[PDB]
Amino acid sequence: SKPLKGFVICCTSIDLKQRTEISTKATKLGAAYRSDFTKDVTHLIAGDFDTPKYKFAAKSRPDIKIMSSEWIPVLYESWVQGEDLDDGLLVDKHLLPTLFKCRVCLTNIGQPERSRIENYVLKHGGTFCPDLTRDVTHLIAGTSSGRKYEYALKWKINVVCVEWLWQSIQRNAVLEPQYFQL
């Protein structure tokens, strides 16, 4: 009976069908559902990191949990089937992977730090890209030179130092690239 009383949920980059399912089920669970990102939002369900709502939460609101689209349907399913819930309300099991929708490429980084970066990208839900293509989201560069670097500038792909990755992992959110320039 109203397990999500006091929760205020908002979506970013969630398709209409899934957004309608989430708002309907979250409302039945007792939550408030907000189309705008209001000051009282507690949980942001995100389908991408490259949005103004996501950027605001990553920069200014670490208290707000960034959740996977599957959170509300999975919690609703347990609740409507009469299963016991706990005070965690499955939140920690459905946090959005930090590097969700990231496609990360590397350039000018030696071993073993190059393969360690690749492992961390995969561990945190990103896609690792050995080759640079126009759909890469971040190029982590050891130096500002070379073929991948020049093509990332041409394709307007973010070029960041590895500190972007480390700070994004510890912040549990993709951070903006202008703070991690070479």
């Binding site: 980084i109 030696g110 071993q111 190059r114 080759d131 293509t133 126009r134 070379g146 991948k148 093509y151």
Partner: peptide
């Protein structure tokens, strides 16, 4: 359909 441009992974790698 059309070919894609790829910048290949660096072949010659170095140990830091």
């Amino acid at each position: 359909g059309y070919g894609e441009v790829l910048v290949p992974e660096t072949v010659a790698q170095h140990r830091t």
